[PDB]
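As noted in the main text, all predictions were made from sequence alone. Below is one such record, for enterotoxin H.
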Amino acid sequence: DLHDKSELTDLALANAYGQYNHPFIKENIKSDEISGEKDLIFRNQGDSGNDLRVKFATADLAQKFKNKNVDIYGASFYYKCEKISNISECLYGGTTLNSEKLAQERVIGANVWVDGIQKETELIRTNKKNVTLQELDIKIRKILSDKYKIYYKDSEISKGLIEFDMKTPRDYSFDIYDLKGENDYEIDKIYEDNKTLKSDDISHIDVNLYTK
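Prediction:
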């Protein structure tokens, strides 16, 4: 049972379009301040020179990356982002070690279908050895957002499923209209686990969208 786009508020649609089209991306930064036992602080590295609060699911996760030259790639937001003093910018997970790269860009294909009809195959990449699922998810939704206008209320697409398949019998999927809420601080909690995948172990991506 896939959720219907009609279930989202105009605010939900806007935030979704916005975060999937303008991901926060920063390479080789290091945080060494834990906050609230499960958050990492990167002072002076958010947009506008604001402070960045990277939120994780568990204190363990936060601890695993303190001191780490990490790469960041995720959905950022300001509304309801716990101030660290000044104003602050937030985001969940999307954190990987910077020292782990690939010799060449790993290219992943995404078979696409609208109402069961196959469309042009899409492509996303990453030179990260271990890329977070959030990043892959974002790169796919940006495409689904611009080619199929999934987040425009007046578009014909009303349902959709994104599925990431590994080279082993393991897959991960997202219901593009199943948002925790209408504000990013709730929507993005789906990434707090910081789920990361070995890039070369990913097989392909399946995208099924529907109308009516």
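DSSP finds four helices and 14 strands in the chain. The radius of gyration is 17 Å. These features were considered when defining construct boundaries for the mutagenesis experiments described in Section 2.9.
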